[PDB]
């Protein structure tokens with residue numbers, strides 16, 4: 001794969017991942033965007049060259065590298081109007097950052113409006129040459145990344161504000177829609193007797209997926225970017241922007257087996273081979289599977305996930321047992337989402353630039369009421385109680401700049417302050433749940449916190465966690481190219497956005 005040093009050229013082109021042709025935003029000619037890779041310790045230099053021509057899908061752009069801490073490079077995190085102004089068509093911008101202390105499965109996507117839905121989204125893997133899970137598998141390479149993407153026949157700005165699911169699920173970029181049931185399916189090849197580390201990446205804009213493979217079980221070894229104690233499952237509900245690594249032991253008879261990714265809404269089930277791909281053992285005929293679904297007897301539950309390496313939960317083991325507890329009260333008015341009575345509206349001056357110019361207190365940062373200032377070196381607890389006032393649940397929330405402990409998961413009344421999973425995207429569940437996370441503020445800068453259903457983010461379901469505002473400017477020296485983005489963007493005609 002490309003990386004750690006690469007050009008990512010953005011253009012508009014016609015694609016037919018499910019046999020239906022539509023115009024899209026592509027990266028180096030393709031959507032999903034190509035796999036980027038490197039290894040622990042690398043300096044990534046990803047030069048984003050914006051050659052977009054289509055205003056309906058936005059000619060401007062910004063790229064976020066999902067899951068990376070970006071310590072001291074907050075300016076490269078990507079969210080438009082939080083960490084930078086968007087890049088303009090005919091221009092380039094170099095994202096230059098290091099990953100000294102993380103490895104795992106990540107992804108990358110546009111972080112401007114709903115542009116990632118129109119195609120700017122792909123996988124990103126940082127390999128660990130001393131991976132502690134490596135004795136569990138034989139093969140871990142570019143052909144073991146499995147992407148899931150909800151694909152729409154109508155563009156994000158042309159269809160409904162809140163689409164009722166997608167036309168197709170794409171698995172490694174290919175899939176069928178109900179009207180294109182002869183379109184080519186993705187094929188994942190295995191050799192009998194080998195063990196594979198599959199890296200499952202949800203590139204979804206909205207629906208979650210229930211993933212399974214006929215005749216096979218899956219051993220989870222990683223959740224988002226965090227290594228887990230090996231957990232055997234036979235079904236995985238994966239929410240938008242989550243990842244899992246699992247080991248597959250290709251010990252079944254030589255045959256074709258259905259891979260299934262059933263969306264929570266949209267075109268559900270498997271009629272005509274929608275929501276499906278093919279696991280093909282080497283030597284099997286090159287035809288569609290005729291395997292049948294079996295009821296899961298070991299579905300993934302988040303509470304069964306624990307970190308491989310002990311990871312201490314911040315604070316003391318009781319509710320509110322931290323320096324700064326916060327409760328996020330969700331609402332919706334039919335058009336806009338709200339957190340604590342505020343719907344995020346992106347500011348003209350990016351939040352990071354406001355802070356560099358001297359705005360360090362929440363009352364002086366805009367948009368007011370959506371920016372929370374957190375003290376440095378402190379324990380934080382955030383609760384996200386599900387509510388009928390925020391439809392479109394379960395909302396999968398994501399915190400930039402951090403992995404966090406999930407002390408209470410969806411569908412569980414337990415609080416685990418001992419060995420809960422840490423991750424970066426968590427389902428907030430349905431009414432009755434009170435999903436709760438903890439983390440420590442060791443990462444100066446403004447970090448977005450939002451629902452990763454992109455239509456909801458765009459309708460304002462977000463806040464900014466401005467951590468350690470007093471050391472933010474010193475900790476994140478910016479390049480001139482970043483300073484230059486706002487004047488370029490602010491000069492554009494409305495028709496060239």
Ligand SMILES: *[C@@H]1O[C@H](CO)[C@@H](O[C@@H]2O[C@H](CO)[C@@H](O[C@@H]3O[C@H](CO)[C@@H](O)[C@H](O)[C@@H]3O)[C@H](O)[C@H]2NC(C)=O)[C@H](O)[C@H]1NC(C)=O
Pocket residue numbers: 319320325326327383384385434
């Ligand atoms: C979801 O979980 C959060 C966090 O536990 C809940 O917020 C917390 O709610 C309790 C009330 O049960 C608040 O405690 C109260 O504090 C006041 C003084 O401030 C005291 O007089 C009461 O005796 C009680 O101890 C707590 O402050 C509050 N935490 C935050 C950060 O707001 C939330 O209510 C839960 N939501 C649902 C729907 O379950």
Ligand SMILES: *[C@@H]1O[C@H](CO)[C@@H](O[C@@H]2O[C@H](CO)[C@@H](O[C@H]3O[C@H](CO)[C@@H](O)[C@H](O)[C@@H]3O)[C@H](O)[C@H]2NC(C)=O)[C@H](O)[C@H]1NC(C)=O
Pocket residue numbers: 022023024054055056057153154155158
């Ligand atoms: C710029 O990107 C746009 C979004 O992908 C793309 O929009 C496409 O616009 C046409 C209408 O001009 C839509 O086609 C329609 O017309 C057919 C009959 O030929 C009917 O089925 C419907 O009336 C339908 O609305 C496309 O649906 C729409 N594409 C998407 C994905 O929404 C523009 O075409 C792009 N501009 C250029 C110059 O390529």
Ligand SMILES: [O-][O-]
Pocket residue numbers: 064066111241398452
């Ligand atoms: O990821 O936003």
Ligand SMILES: [Cu+2]
Pocket residue numbers: 064066109241398452
């Ligand atoms: Cu993301």
Ligand SMILES: [Cu+2]
Pocket residue numbers: 064065066067398399400401
């Ligand atoms: Cu992110």
Ligand SMILES: [Cu+2]
Pocket residue numbers: 392394395396451452453456457461
């Ligand atoms: Cu949402």
Ligand SMILES: [Cu+2]
Pocket residue numbers: 064079111398400448450
């Ligand atoms: Cu984000």
Ligand code: NA
Pocket residue numbers: 001002003004036037038
């Ligand atoms: Na690479």
Ligand code: NA
Pocket residue numbers: 102103104225226227
């Ligand atoms: Na990791």
